[PDB]
């Protein structure tokens, strides 16, 4: 027992069922804290010993965090949420501040525990289950389900709501100017403060939440280089778009042309007016690829002129809040990668370029994830919402290494892709 | 406008203990990454890294000397000490404290330095 | 404990003069040393933070130079004030160490 408070009652989507998605293999030492955090939430009666009866399942893993070197238990609760979008997105959706992607420094707080003080719908349990696995399969599995709101349920942060309102009213009529926002297990807090200042409001607002209930992960800050924890906040301006640019060679042979015909065609699904005739003609008859065709002075006048058509935003983008989010990402190569947020095709909301972490280690693996992370971030404090990533990668493969580097409390829906490099419509020299 | 100076005794008998106080303004201990770190500089020798006490009382010291030192702040009147205890006519040397501040992934410089204070070590 | 070696320790040059001091490592630091300047005073300044970024208010005529185990401080061309003792310390890991220090004197 936790809340006298009366548990709201959660219904999946009409004609589905619960999640029954199977365990996935983990390493002891995850295991190990899974078996720990578990054990003693289990004493605290947050979760409850469960058995074959329970036909419902869905993954754990658990994730060291760099951020506090303590163990995160991870419940992927992706299909559930799926299962479950009615409730906590038309029904109790928690609104988005449009200026949060405004502030000069956005912390993020990991505010997960909140949830364990709520009674979840005694009936909506059954869904909640996991099974934790067992070195060389030693003993059968062993499994739990919830009574509190569990982490990484999109519903948790919905019903919870009323709690944090009032838990925050005192916090923010003191602060008219720090923007918070709630995205799951999350709390987006952003500032103009000096950088200095801001650091220390997140202390207050840490203190604050301790004065009622809510702890919040111990962040480290070691005295060693990196400081990494430099990077700890988030800053939104830093924050700018990747368009799309025209080449510039001193002569064009065929090939050249070709390929700027290539891409500046493709591109002509994006931007308006994008002619490709006049520099075509320029390639009229079947000549050798090698060959330097001089431009011409009618083509070269709009070479020198589409570009300046790619030098502007996607003009007649608008958000839909009603629709999803897909985001590609093309791996560019030497570290680099790139990407492009959109609702419709070819109407991108935002495109971009994930430079890369100097921790990448010659690790595509590691540096995708990361860049998948770092754009889930992006959309949470742009529009409130994640995107489903087309991910360049082999499904199998990924699967094999993604919670490795894996350092978040959310997860994003995913799909891979084998497209090749077509055209480099997004990328430079 | 960031500065600091060092007091302390300036002569100290041997197998005693000596604390010294850096009296700073234009910065606070409070500020994350903010610091400050006591040097000594025996007579005629170099610099010699003591200890440095940061904002969040993650403090570190010498090796050789954690043993005898101790570093301390009162943040509300912008001073740090460094306690030294058991001296020894080695100690004698010019002490400065100096504001250390932790800025980017990777600058970490003692930006501002104080004078010094002249501990000797003799009966 | 990275012991850190300025092996010329007394220099003598000339105004105009460009000059270069060595600190080497234990071990490579990863940029992350900085020099310092002390006058015949004795007064000691912050030059140059990680490796080679000028600090504030210094003389635009310093530079820091260097990589892994070996940097250099290079002063451009020598005013009567540069003629001082110098020092690198590394910030890699505690205990923070500083070099033995190069004297920079005046030729005559």
């Known amino acids: 027992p936790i809340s006298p408070i009366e548990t709201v009652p959660v219904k999946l989507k009409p004609g589905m069922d619960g999640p029954k998605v199977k365990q996935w293999p983990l390493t002891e030492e995850k295991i190990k804290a899974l078996v720990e955090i578990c054990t003693e939430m289990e004493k605290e009666g947050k979760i409850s010993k469960i058995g074959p009866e329970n036909p419902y399942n869905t993954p754990v893993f658990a994730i060291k965090k760099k951020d506090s070197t303590k163990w995160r238990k991870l419940v992927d609760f992706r299909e559930l949420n799926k299962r479950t979008q009615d409730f906590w997105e038309v029904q109790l959706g928690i609104p988005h501040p449009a200026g949060l992607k405004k502030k000069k420094s956005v912390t993020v707080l990991d505010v997960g525990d909140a949830y364990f003080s709520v009674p979840l719908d005694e009936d909506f349990r059954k869904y909640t289950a996991f099974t934790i696995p067992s070195i060389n399969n030693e003993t059968p599995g062993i499994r739990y389900q919830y009574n509190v709101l569990p982490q990484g349920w999109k519903g948790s942060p919905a019903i919870f709501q009323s709690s944090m309102t009032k838990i925050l009213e005192p916090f923010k009529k003191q602060n008219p100017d720090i923007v918070i926002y709630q995205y799951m297990d999350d709390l987006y807090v952003g500032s103009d403060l000096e950088i200095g200042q801001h650091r220390t409001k997140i202390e207050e607002l840490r203190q604050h939440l301790l004065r009622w209930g809510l702890t919040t992960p111990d962040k480290k800050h070691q005295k060693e280089p990196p400081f990494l924890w430099m990077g700890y906040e988030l800053h939104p301006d830093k924050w700018t778009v990747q368009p799309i640019v025209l080449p510039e060679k001193d002569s064009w042979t065929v090939n050249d042309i070709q390929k700027l015909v290539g891409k500046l065609n493709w591109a002509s699904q994006i931007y308006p007016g994008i002619k490709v005739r006049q520099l075509s003609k320029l390639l009229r008859g079947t000549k050798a690829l090698t060959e330097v065709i001089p431009l011409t002075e009618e083509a070269e006048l709009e070479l020198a002129e589409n570009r300046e058509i790619l030098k502007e935003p996607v003009h007649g983008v608008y958000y839909d809040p009603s629709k999803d989010l897909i985001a590609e990402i093309q791996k560019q190569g030497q570290g680099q990668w790139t990407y492009q947020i959109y609702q419709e095709p070819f109407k991108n909301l935002k495109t971009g370029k994930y430079a890369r972490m100097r921790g990448a280690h010659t690790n595509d693996v590691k540096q995708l994830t990361e860049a998948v992370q770092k754009i889930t971030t992006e959309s949470i404090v742009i529009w409130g919402k994640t995107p489903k990533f087309k991910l360049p990668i082999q499904k199998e493969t990924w699967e094999t290494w993604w919670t490795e580097y894996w350092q978040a409390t959310w997860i994003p829906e995913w799909e891979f892709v084998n497209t090749p490099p077509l055209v480099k419509l997004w990328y430079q020299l | 406008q960031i500065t600091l100076k060092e007091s302390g005794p300036g002569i100290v008998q041997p197998s005693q203990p000596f604390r010294l106080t850096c009296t700073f303004s234009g910065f606070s201990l409070s500020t994350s990454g903010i610091g400050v770190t006591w040097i000594r500089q025996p007579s005629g020798k170099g610099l010699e890294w003591l200890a440095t006490?940061?904002?969040?009382?993650?403090?570190r010291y010498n090796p050789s000397l954690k043993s005898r030192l101790t570093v301390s702040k009162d943040t509300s009147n912008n001073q740090a000490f460094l306690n030294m205890m058991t001296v020894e006519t080695a100690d004698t040397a010019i002490y400065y404290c100096?504001?250390?501040?932790?800025?980017?992934?990777?600058?970490?410089?003692?930006?501002?330095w104080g004078q010094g204070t002249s501990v000797t070590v003799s009966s | 404990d990275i012991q850190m070696t300025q092996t010329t320790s007394s220099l003598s040059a000339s105004l105009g003069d460009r000059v270069t001091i060595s600190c080497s490592a234990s071990?490579?630091?990863?940029?992350?040393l900085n020099w310092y300047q002390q006058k015949p005073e004795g007064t000691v300044k912050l030059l140059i933070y990680?490796?080679?970024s000028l600090h504030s208010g210094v003389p635009s005529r310093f530079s820091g130079s260097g990589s892994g185990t070996d940097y250099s401080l290079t002063i451009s061309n020598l005013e009567p004030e540069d003629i001082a003792t110098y020092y690198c310390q590394q910030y890699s890991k505690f205990p923070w160490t500083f070099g033995g220090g190069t004297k920079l004197e005046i030729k005559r």
């Open positions: 006490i940061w904002w969040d009382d993650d403090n």
């Open positions: 071990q490579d630091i990863s940029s992350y």
């Open positions: 100096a504001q250390s501040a932790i800025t980017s992934v990777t600058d970490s410089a003692m930006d501002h």
């Open positions: 990680y490796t080679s």
